[PDB]
Write a protein that binds this ligand. Structure first.
Ligand SMILES: Nc1ncnc2c1ncn2[C@@H]1O[C@H](COP(=O)(O)OP(=O)(O)OP(O)(O)=S)[C@@H](O)[C@H]1O
Ligand SMILES: Nc1ncnc2c1ncn2[C@@H]1O[C@H](COP(=O)(O)OP(=O)(O)OP(O)(O)=S)[C@@H](O)[C@H]1O
Ligand SMILES: [K+]
Ligand SMILES: [K+]
Ligand SMILES: [Mg+2]
Ligand SMILES: [Mg+2]
Lengths: 607, 145, 607, 145
């Protein structure tokens, strides 16, 4: 067998890397700024041992000069520069990354991290330009010109016509006739704000007015510092830079993880719900913001950035390959945000503004997420019969629980006024049982999945549920039910199939009758919400044996008026009235209004 | 080599439904109830419910299922079959009811065997769409969000 | 200036193309099958001129042989094969694509389209394998072995130990110890079902039971044929192959566009709403399904595939670069689907099943889309006072319009029973004006953006709107209003700030009073829907001067009972009763139920 | 060269609001109404409404606007300013009312000048969130879906 080294076709590899690698055309600016940043990290590293190399050009900056009169976009940097041998080896060879070679040559204990590791990022500039004119100047060499028209060969010529620069590299990009948009002020600022916003070196842009120098990276990244030394106004300016929001962030959670996977994430909580926002950075370079399994949907209300160095970047640095470390970051983000939510709960003044804007998000997490369902339950705050003045927590609900109460009672509705005076509270108030108030449609969706809190089962009072009772009460209530048995039979066959059964309930002290949904099914509010969604059961008739209306009803039945006209009309009127008090929207509202107009006319002595 | 077909596999799901064992059991047998959450059903027998060893077509005749054995509110075993599948392929699905009186829920542990290897995700994802979410929205046996 | 040709570092280019190009690991199988497909397209092309080249191996197939006892995944193909010179030039040189060179050498008028155009897809197999053993055999050369361990060089040896194959290429992939998942039956079938489902040649998989051959591409793509020759059962099997749905597609729209941009799209309409599905193919090869703006959100209920050849594929063929031709395909998809919707509307029997499942999607398009807002308006079907038996169209609503009606009247509500008997219809029925019935919450969102249909302005009868009237009626109605002016003033200051004004309306013939929302604002149903969303004004009191209740009310006011206890209690009762009839969910239902219980007790002579 | 700042630009939007000009005009002036749809406002004057040449801070003092001229239900001109912007940068926004009685709507043509070049999308996207959708949800001046 004969051995052959692998080869590569150069005339076709250039077309594949330039045209069929990078999706967006504006990515060419991100690679040139990154290369300028890497160059500024080499000369700065040499300044730690020999300051003479830096005194040639002490000002470290990145200057961008658009020229509409010449259709040339110049990008000047004061880095280490490239020698004649480096222009033909590092810049003239595909996949040759001199920046990565400089990283491997660093001493043990260095603190200079660079981005250049592939070696094909320079060729990305030809997406918007036809020919490039790279002007380089190093301390240990002369000033040369690197000119190439994206063909097959490049020309290296001793610079004898351009300006004499001290140190660095100048890149003259002859943009295409159809790519002249990158010479405008708006497009240049857009790419830097998108990809090179947190460069460690000031990026200067020559803006004409009179020509001025515009600093496009005034905001510095805060993930390189400890969260203790960072003040509050610094986090506010950082939030206003990563996001277009105008208000200050309500809360900021800056943590750092080390070990097998290191990443520094600064997560902000806005003041109001924005009804992916987590950006990913790799060494002061924006990668992408389309991470799918990075943060759950119910948690997507927060913003911030995540800087890491172990992310498997692809050739274009526009997306992350399929890996197993993203779910590790996802768990850490959820863990730190839940712990951050507990820190907000420690201050009642701050948690009020947090809950008044992100209540739906917390309740959605209990409905969707299961790993931290019990953890997010500590954040749910609702009103009750004993807390009509403030939003009480589920933990405080257990503290006020008597020794004989073992069920968390709650009630759903459309608003607070519809549940604070509901007749279903008369039974629990007589037994001194606190009942939670639910005013949002998503409240029942959260309790449907929780089902328990600190060993107490969630029980909806609108559903058919039995309450604690003694043998003395059962002996007196059972004999009273059978006396109303002909009445319950009379109320059953009159309504027809509208209800499943007519029973004598003792949980009603003031209302003469009410309607409760069947157990194991949806509630009164749930049926109303499901039928009211723009993108989108069994009832029980209960009567109160202590009200004078029901007492008069059983009298008319015993007289022989089971099919009497007045009894049937009064039963249907009381049935539809109980639907309104229970929260059921009655069908055919004109039949109800017609019966009301009759009683109104009879009240006015109008026959 | 010879030309033939692949092997079979088995999956296991536990979709939780808020419905008593009496109503959920009759949901998969009552022909009037079946036509509600399926919107397409053709029964060979003219009986009021599903009997043992009774074939019936669902979803435009593409799904062929047959009740081979069933216990009173506890077991439901069907011979599930798809029209796109080959003739020797016959899948068996077992439904076990677990009524939890503490939370008023009901866990329906589904053991589905006989599924082709290249048909795992097709019958599992659709089971949460045509069997789980369809009943939860038609009869209201649980919230969907 | 000295000129230097561009070079490439081979030892690093291999690591970049293999590791940092392809995101998913399963993509290695798509490239090998595509290469096998290209090989089967070269020998087949030669069969058109010389059949002797095909008689060596007439059976054209792709055989995949997993071997768990050896950890080797073999992929056999009966293509043209590679000679010794081709294994060292086409397979040994990076970015060298012998398939693309064969395409450029085709004669004028060929009908053989291949996928191989880059020249780096072969190297993708090393993502899951350490060393490869390519066994090739061509007609004009001998059988050789191409072995390479993804290092720096490859070995070419005359095959003298393996089996003697007729013609084609065998690839033995020594998978990694952690990549043994690709040797199972499930993972192999998953990748072919995902990427190589519509290969023009049968893909054989050796499945052990006894070993059998499994065909993984039994379903053939229908976009290569004309839509006329394709029957209905072929479209049903194609829909069941591209999607996991079990039911037959309700409608199929197969069109083809030529010219500056050619693409063949087969779009299916399911039977029910699935509450991106459009796949993109390039020459019988799946590319991606994550198109951002290929189809609007309101139109995402349809499925199907789109095959094109002008898509700017990237190096990994996993996504499409930013371009301007996708919006051209988007307009053609919308145009063809809207025309397809009109074809469904021609058959009343088929449109009933289409509207009963995709009514919300069509109404959402009128609310969201503006370019085809008037076009989608022809598909809206609702009930009316004259169409209580069938869903009438907006076009038929104009045909039944009298010569004096110039406004489309509609009413919102929770269901059909709440709007079919509403008292707001008595005025329009007296004038013989048809009124549309709206039962879905999204109905008002569609009419809020349409605002007009065939020159007729959409008018909601629940809002304050003036009706046609003559000078004779205005002279008799104006003098009647001022007689009820003390009554309207009495009803105003009693309710307080609950209503904005109390006016005497003549649009009520049976109901004594009703509530209508203020103009320019939300309606009664809109306020109910907005407050009932899980993810989330002004009223007017109108009285009827012809009802005996209002006649008795003005009498009590003239007697001196403007602040009478009976008058105030009756006004509040009539006001809340009007809220129920109009569709308003009144607050504090117990205060209403308490007043009903009083009239119930007074009706039973209970003091 | 010298160090300084960039130039300015101008944008034009037409957010349609379902509200009469009377209510919409007073919405941007009534201090009680402004605090509703902004949830944060710092009015320096002790008057019941906004007067000519009156500065007021919005959204936690980050937004600085001043009514320099206003017609009667027809024109609203404000000197909009952001705290993140430089001192010489002062933007001007003009609001014109185009209430229509046939469709029962009102088109508020907004001509916003003086915006920095690197602040176009930041003030345009937020205008549809803090100014357009905020009023449509607080007072109900149009449906949001
Ligand atoms: N502006 C510059 N100043 C100095 N050296 C530069 C400059 N641009 C590029 N280089 C050098 O040229 C080499 C090749 O250029 P690149 O193709 O950008 O390599 P790269 O930056 O490592 O690749 P990526 O895609 O950015 S990881 C770099 O490794 C640097 O050593
Ligand atoms: N199984 C095969 N049988 C015959 N020739 C093959 C086979 N696989 C690869 N080749 C040849 O080897 C060349 C180089 O392989 P590849 O890297 O796959 O090139 P390619 O297929 O054009 O690149 P892409 O990514 O598929 S566009 C191809 O152009 C073919 O001519
Ligand atoms: K290079
Ligand atoms: K190759
Ligand atoms: Mg670079
Ligand atoms: Mg390939």
């Amino acid at each position: 067998g004969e051995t052959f080294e692998f080869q590569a076709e150069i005339t076709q590899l250039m077309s594949l890397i330039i045209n069929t690698v990078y999706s967006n055309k504006e990515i060419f600016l991100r690679e040139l700024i990154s290369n300028a940043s890497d160059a500024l990290d080499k000369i700065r590293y040499q300044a730690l041992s020999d300051p003479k190399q830096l005194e040639t050009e002490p000002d470290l900056f990145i200057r961008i000069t658009p020229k509409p009169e010449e259709k040339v976009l110049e990008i000047r940097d004061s880095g280490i520069g490239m020698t004649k041998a480096e222009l033909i080896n590092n810049l003239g060879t595909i996949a040759k990354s001199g920046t990565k070679a400089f990283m491997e040559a660093l001493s043990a204990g260095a603190d200079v991290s660079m981005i250049g590791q592939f070696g094909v990022g320079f060729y990305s500039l030809f997406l918007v330009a036809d020919r490039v004119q790279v002007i380089s100047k190093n301390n240990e060499d002369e000033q040369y010109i690197w000119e190439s028209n994206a063909g097959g060969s490049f020309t290296v010529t001793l610079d004898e016509v351009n300006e004499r620069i001290g140190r660095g590299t100048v890149l003259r990009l002859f943009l295409k006739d159809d790519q002249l948009e990158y010479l405008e002020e708006k497009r240049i600022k857009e790419v830097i704000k998108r990809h090179s916003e947190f460069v460690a070196y000031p990026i200067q842009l020559l803006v004409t007015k009179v020509q001025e120098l515009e600093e496009l990276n005034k905001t510095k990244p805060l993930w390189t510092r400890n969260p203790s030394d960072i003040t509050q106004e610094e986090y506010n300016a950082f939030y206003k830079s990563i996001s277009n929001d105008w208000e200050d962030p309500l809360y900021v959670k800056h943590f750092s993880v080390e070990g097998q996977l290191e990443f520094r994430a600064i997560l902000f909580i806005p003041k109001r719900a924005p009804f992916n926002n987590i950006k990913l950075y790799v060494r002061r370079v924006f990668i992408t913001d389309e991470a799918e399994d990075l943060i759950p949907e119910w948690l997507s209300f927060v913003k911030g950035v995540v800087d890491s160095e172990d992310l498997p970047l692809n050739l274009s640095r526009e997306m992350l390959q399929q890996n197993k470390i993203m779910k590790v970051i996802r768990k850490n983000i959820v863990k730190k945000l839940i712990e951050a939510f507990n820190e907000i709960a420690e201050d009642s003044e701050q948690f009020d503004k947090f809950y008044s804007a992100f209540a739906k998000n917390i309740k959605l997490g209990v409905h969707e997420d299961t790993q931290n369902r019990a953890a997010l339950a500590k954040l749910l705050r609702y009103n009750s019969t004993k807390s009509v003045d403030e939003l009480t927590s589920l933990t405080d609900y257990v503290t006020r629980m008597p020794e004989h109460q073992k069920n968390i009672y709650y009630i759903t509705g459309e608003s607070l006024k519809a549940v604070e005076k509901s007749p279903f509270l008369d039974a629990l108030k007589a037994k001194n049982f606190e009942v939670l108030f639910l005013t949002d449609p998503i409240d029942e969706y959260a309790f449907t999945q929780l089902k328990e809190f600190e060993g107490k089962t969630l029980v909806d009072i609108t559903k058919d549920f039995e309450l604690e009772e003694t043998d003395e009460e059962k002996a007196e209530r059972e004999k009273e039910i059978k006396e109303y048995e002909p009445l319950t039979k009379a109320l059953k066959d009159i309504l027809g199939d509208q209800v499943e059964k007519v029973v004598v309930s003792y949980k009603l002290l003031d209302a003469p009758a009410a309607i409760r949904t069947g157990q194991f099914g949806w509630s009164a509010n749930m049926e109303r919400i499901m039928k009211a969604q723009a993108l989108r059961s069994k009832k029980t008739f209960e009567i109160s044996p202590k009200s004078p209306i029901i007492k008069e009803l059983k009298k008319r039945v015993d007289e022989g008026g089971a099919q009497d006209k007045t009894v049937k009309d009064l039963t249907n009127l009381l049935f539809e009235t109980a639907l309104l008090t229970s929260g059921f929207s009655l069908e055919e509202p004109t039949s109800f209004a017609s019966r009301i107009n009759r009683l109104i006319s009879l009240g006015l002595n109008i026959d | 080599p010879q030309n033939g077909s692949g092997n079979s596999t088995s999956i296991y799901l536990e979709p939780t439904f808020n419905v008593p064992s009496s109503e959920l059991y009759e949901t998969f047998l009552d022909k009037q109830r079946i036509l509600a959450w399926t919107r397409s059903a053709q029964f060979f027998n003219s009986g009021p419910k599903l009997e043992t060893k009774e074939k019936f077509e669902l979803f435009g005749g593409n799904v062929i299922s047959e009740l081979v054995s069933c216990e009173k509110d506890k077991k439901l075993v069907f011979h599930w079959k798809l029209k796109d599948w080959s003739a020797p392929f016959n899948s068996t699905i077992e439904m076990t009811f677990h009524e939890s009186q503490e939370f008023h829920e009901t866990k329906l542990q589904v053991k589905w065997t006989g599924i082709p290897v290249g048909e795992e995700d097709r019958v599992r994802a659709n089971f949460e769409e045509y069997y789980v979410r369809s009943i939860k929205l038609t009869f209201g046996f649980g919230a969907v969000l």
